[PDB]
């Protein structure tokens, strides 16, 4: 929690939990390959329960859900996915974050199983489904909307 | 059983109490002070939102109840561009 | 008409494909050669190891009489 | 599972029920929530009167069209009978 | 936990068996229709399980089911606990 | 009546265990004599069910038909893994 409150960030802009959820994390050629698997369910669960910034964004504009749905092995260790997906949605992690290249993680699921999991964990909700339209059609929100709604639109 | 919602532009909208309870503000407004303890009407005023958006959330109130988690072929929501940025000032006031 | 009836449940993982019909095992566990599970134009999910060895034998989907291709 | 939007002046009532049911209680669900005499109602779907014993499934609308986003709106009227008088929803402020 | 008055008229003792590690199976179709008295019960439980446990196909097993029977048509004497 | 197919079910399952047993043997052995392979399959599988020789003979042919393994060109007794 001390490190997370200090919040280190990678060169690629990934937060610590972003480094926890990805699959391209390099692992040392020694016995870490035996046990340090990625993405890891327990690591992400303990990081989120410890107080990680779940809505942290990278330099690529994505969130943790965007990275985890892009996993290349969805049915190899599906339970881990079924853990981490039920982890992040349990604490923040807006399921329709819509990264800076106008891509919701549902559109970046790239897998039927992952998109089924996300749809089961998606929520019929507020001005997120009622904001995808107002950001698809360019309506001026520049101080035409509340101040927290500026970042709300900037996500959605 | 049913709740009444009064829009800014004179319009009064009546929907199921459970359907309007999906938004936190209505839950907050109906509870505590201003409860209007008649258990049948429970009218609430809204001098900020216009009539169409209050009709739009009432459409959305029934939309959420029907499709909480079932019928995976979920129909989308046809939000008009002319009603966009107006409902974008409403749901945060409603905590839907 | 009823007060305390209850039955026995049985849950899968909502996976559209049940088993890898090459080694006749589940999809969740590793292949017999080893992991990596492939897909086909016939919408059948088998292991990459189970399929790369299959195409050496024949380039035909094992269930239906259709020419296998990758995804 | 047909969804309705009952209209009478500024007052609007949202309604959902099955198709195979008479419109008698449709005249009475509004009666319970308006605290008004029951026999004075006269529902007007598309500016026409229909039988009180007739079901709303045969009244003209189906569920495949009356989805909650665009429910089958109907006009209500009370005996002074008297013709339907509803208030259309105000237009949102258009974009510049 | 639900907001409205959710009363089922039925009490539960569910044995949520795991995946194919359990040896019992049902290879014939044998589509026994759900009784309408407990239809609200199974829909509530299916909605409950699919929400708390995402990605789970609750395939119901009725050939090894259990439960009680009421005989109010006769006049309701005693109870009976034959299969479903 | 239902317990005899359960005997066949594990018998079907033991063949699947037998098929996976030869593959992991030949992944490291590459080539192995058939008589030594008879003891080799039994050696690791002795912790579980004891496989009779007749079940092994058909499992070699099934694995040969699946083309995971085939007989060595130098000796028909010797087998080659691919
Ligand atoms: Zn396989
Ligand atoms: Zn493999
Ligand atoms: Zn096929």
Curated annotation (Swiss-Prot), chain A:
Q: Where are the ANK repeats?
A: 12-56, 60-97
Q: In which tissues is it expressed?
A: Widely expressed. Highly expressed in testis. Weakly expressed in other tissues.
Instruction: Kindly list any coiled-coil regions of this protein.
Output: none
The lineage's top-level taxon is Eukaryota
Compartment(s): Cytoplasm; Nucleus
> How does the record describe its quaternary structure?
Component of a CRL2 E3 ubiquitin-protein ligase complex, also named ECS (Elongin BC-CUL2/5-SOCS-box protein) complex, composed of CUL2, Elongin BC (ELOB and ELOC), RBX1 and substrate-specific adapter FEM1B. Homooligomer. Interacts with PPM1F and PHTF1. Interacts with the death domain of FAS/TNFRSF6 and TNFRSF1A. Interacts with CHEK1. Interacts with NKX3-1.
In the record, the note on similarity to other proteins reads:
Belongs to the fem-1 family.
Q: What does this protein do?
A: Substrate-recognition component of a Cul2-RING (CRL2) E3 ubiquitin-protein ligase complex of the DesCEND (destruction via C-end degrons) pathway, which recognizes a C-degron located at the extreme C terminus of target proteins, leading to their ubiquitination and degradation. The C-degron recognized by the DesCEND pathway is usually a motif of less than ten residues and can be present in full-length proteins, truncated proteins or proteolytically cleaved forms.
Q: Please identify the protein, giving its name as recorded.
A: Protein fem-1 homolog B
Please tell me the species this chain comes from: Homo sapiens (Human)
Q: Which gene encodes it?
A: FEM1B
Which residues of the parent protein does this chain contain?
472 to 627 of 627
From Swiss-Prot, chain C:
Instruction: Summarize the impact of residue 42 to A.
Output: Strong reduction in ligase activity
Q: Which GO terms describe its biological process?
A: cellular response to amino acid stimulus; cellular response to chemical stress; cellular response to oxidative stress; cellular response to UV; DNA damage response; MAPK cascade; negative regulation of canonical Wnt signaling pathway; negative regulation of insulin receptor signaling pathway
RING-type zinc finger locations on the chain: 31-65
The domain-related comment in the record is: The RING-type zinc finger domain is essential for ubiquitin ligase activity. It coordinates an additional third zinc ion.
Give the chief site where it resides: cytoplasm
**What happens upon changing residue 31 to A?**
Strong reduction in ligase activity
The record's similarity note reads:
Belongs to the RING-box family.
Name listed for the protein in its UniProt record: E3 ubiquitin-protein ligase RBX1
Pathway annotation? Protein modification; protein ubiquitination; Protein modification; protein neddylation
GO molecular function list: cullin family protein binding; molecular adaptor activity; NEDD8 ligase activity; NEDD8 transferase activity; protein-containing complex binding; RNA polymerase II-specific DNA-binding transcription factor binding; ubiquitin protein ligase activity; ubiquitin protein ligase binding
What is the reported tissue distribution? Widely expressed.
Keywords associated with the record = Acetylation, Cytoplasm, DNA damage, DNA repair, Host-virus interaction, Metal-binding, Nucleus, Phosphoprotein, Transferase, Ubl conjugation pathway, Zinc, Zinc-finger
Task: Give the species.
Answer: Homo sapiens (Human)
Positions bound to Zn(2+) 2: 31, 34-35, 49
Q: Which residues of the full protein are shown?
A: 23 to 104 of 108
Superkingdom of the source?
Eukaryota
- Positions binding Zn(2+) 1 in this chain are 20, 23, 47, 50
EC no. given is 2.3.2.27, 2.3.2.32
UniProtKB/Swiss-Prot annotation, chain D:
Gene Ontology cellular-component terms listed: Cul2-RING ubiquitin ligase complex; Cul5-RING ubiquitin ligase complex; cytosol; elongin complex; nucleoplasm; VCB complex
Primary site of residence: nucleus
From which domain of life does this come?
A: Eukaryota
UniProt pathway: Protein modification; protein ubiquitination
| One Gene Ontology biological process | positive regulation of proteasomal ubiquitin-dependent protein catabolic process
Provide the GO MF annotations for this entry: transcription corepressor binding; ubiquitin protein ligase binding
Q: What is this protein called?
A: Elongin-B
Answer yes or no on keyword Acetylation: yes
Q: Summarize the subunit comment.
A: Heterotrimer of an A (ELOA, ELOA2 or ELOA3P), ELOB and ELOC subunit. The elongin BC complex interacts with EPOP; leading to recruit the elongin BC complex to Polycomb group (PcG) target genes, thereby restricting excessive activity of the PRC2/EED-EZH2 complex. (Microbial infection) Following infection by HIV-1 virus, component of a cullin-5-RING E3 ubiquitin-protein ligase complex (ECS complex) hijacked by the HIV-1 Vif protein.
Known function: SIII, also known as elongin, is a general transcription elongation factor that increases the RNA polymerase II transcription elongation past template-encoded arresting sites. Subunit A is transcriptionally active and its transcription activity is strongly enhanced by binding to the dimeric complex of the SIII regulatory subunits B and C (elongin BC complex).
Describe the location of the Ubiquitin-like domain by residue ranges.
1-65
Q: Which family does it belong to?
A: Belongs to the Elongin B family.
Give the encoding gene's name. ELOB
The listed locations are: Nucleus
UniProtKB/Swiss-Prot annotation, chain F:
Query: Altering residue 57 to R: what's the impact?
Result: No effect on conjugation with NEDD8
Position(s) of the covalent cross-link Glycyl lysine isopeptide (Lys-Gly) (interchain with G-Cter in NEDD8)? 27
Q: Which domain of life is it from?
A: Eukaryota
Location of the Cullin neddylation domain: 13-73
> Mind telling me how this protein is modified after translation?
Neddylated; which enhances the ubiquitination activity of ECS (Elongin BC-CUL2/5-SOCS-box protein) E3 ubiquitin-protein ligase complexes. Neddylation leads to structural rearrangment in the complex that allows interaction between the E2 ubiquitin-conjugating enzyme and the acceptor ubiquitin. CBC(VHL) complex formation seems to promote neddylation. Deneddylated via its interaction with the COP9 signalosome (CSN) complex.
Q: Where in the cell is it found?
A: Nucleus
How does the entry describe the domains?
Answer: The Cullin neddylation domain restrains the RING domain of RBX1 in the E3 ubiquitin-protein ligase complex; this restraint is removed upon neddylation of the cullin.
Its quaternary organisation is:
Component of multiple Cul2-RING (CRL2) E3 ubiquitin-protein ligase complexes consisting of CUL2, Elongin BC (ELOB and ELOC), RBX1 and a variable substrate-specific adapter; this complex is also known as ECS (Elongin BC-CUL2/5-SOCS-box protein) complex and may consist of CUL2 or CUL5. Component of a ECS(VHL) or CBC(VHL) complex containing CUL2, RBX1, ELOB, ELOC and VHL. Component of the ECS(MED8) complex with the probable substrate recognition component MED8.
| Family affiliation | Belongs to the cullin family.
According to UniProt, the name of this protein is: Cullin-2
Q: What is the lineage of its organism?
A: Eukaryota, Metazoa, Chordata, Craniata, Vertebrata
Gene name linked to the record = CUL2
């Amino acid at each position: 929690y001390n490190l997370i409150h200090l919040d280190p960030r990678t060169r690629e802009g990934f937060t610590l939990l972003h480094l926890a959820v990805n699959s391209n994390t390099p692992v040392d050629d020694f016995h870490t390959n035996d046990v340090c698997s990625f993405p890891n369910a327990l690591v992400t669960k303990l990081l989120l329960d410890c107080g990680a910034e779940v809505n942290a964004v990278d330099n690529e504009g994505n969130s943790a859900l965007h990275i985890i749905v892009q996993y290349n092995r969805p049915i190899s260790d599906f339970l881990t996915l079924h853990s981490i997906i039920i982890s992040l949605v349990e604490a923040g992690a807006h399921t329709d974050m819509t990264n800076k290249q106008n891509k919701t993680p549902l559109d970046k699921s790239t897998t039927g199983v992952s998109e089924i999991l996300l749809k089961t964990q998606m929520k019929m909700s507020l001005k997120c489904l009622a904001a995808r339209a107002v950001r698809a059609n360019d309506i001026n929100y520049q101080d035409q909307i509340p101040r927290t709604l500026e970042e709300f639109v900037g996500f959605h | 059983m049913y709740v009444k919602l009064i829009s800014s532009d004179g319009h009064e909208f009546i929907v199921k109490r459970e359907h309007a309870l999906t938004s936190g503000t209505i839950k907050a407004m109906l509870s505590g002070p201003g409860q209007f303890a008649e258990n049948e009407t429970n009218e609430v005023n809204f001098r900020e939102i216009p009539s169409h958006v209050l009709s739009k959330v009432c459409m959305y109130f029934t939309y959420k109840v029907r499709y909480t988690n079932s019928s995976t072929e979920i129909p989308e929501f046809p939000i008009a561009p002319e009603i966009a940025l107006e409902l974008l000032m409403a749901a945060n006031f409603l905590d839907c | 008409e009823v007060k305390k009836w209850n039955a026995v449940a049985l849950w899968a993982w909502d996976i559209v494909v049940d088993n890898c019909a090459i080694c006749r095992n589940h999809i969740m566990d590793l292949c017999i050669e080893c992991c990596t599970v492939a897909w086909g134009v016939c919408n059948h999910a088998f292991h990459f190891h189970c399929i790369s060895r299959w195409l050496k034998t024949r380039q035909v989907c094992p269930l239906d009489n259709r020419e296998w291709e990758f995804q | 599972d047909v969804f309705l939007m009952i209209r009478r002046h500024k007052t609007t009532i949202f309604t959902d029920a099955k198709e195979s049911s008479t419109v008698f209680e449709l005249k009475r669900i509004v009666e319970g929530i308006l605290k008004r005499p029951p026999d004075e109602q006269r529902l007007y779907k598309d500016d026409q009167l229909l039988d009180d014993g007739k079901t709303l499934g045969e009244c003209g609308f189906t569920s495949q069209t009356a989805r909650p986003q665009a429910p089958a709106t109907v006009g209500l009227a009370f005996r002074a009978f008297e013709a339907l008088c509803i208030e259309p929803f105000s237009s949102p402020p258009e974009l510049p | 936990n639900q907001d409205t008055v959710i009363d089922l008229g039925i009490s539960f003792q569910i044995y949520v068996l795991q995946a194919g590690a359990w040896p019992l199976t049902q290879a014939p179709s044998s589509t026994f229709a759900i009784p309408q008295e407990l239809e609200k019960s199974v829909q509530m439980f299916e909605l409950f399980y699919s929400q708390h446990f995402s990605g789970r196909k609750l395939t119901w097993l009725h050939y090894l089911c259990t439960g009680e029977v009421k005989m109010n048509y006769l006049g309701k004497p005693y109870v009976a606990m034959v299969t479903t | 009546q239902e317990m005899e197919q359960t005997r066949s079910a594990v018998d079907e399952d033991r063949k699947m265990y037998l098929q996976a047993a030869i593959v992991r043997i030949m992944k490291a052995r590459k080539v192995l004599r058939h008589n030594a392979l008879i003891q080799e399959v039994i050696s690791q599988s002795r912790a579980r069910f004891n496989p009779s020789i007749s079940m092994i003979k058909k499992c070699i042919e099934v694995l040969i038909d699946k083309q995971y393994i085939e007989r060595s060109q130098a000796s028909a007794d010797e087998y080659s893994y691919v």
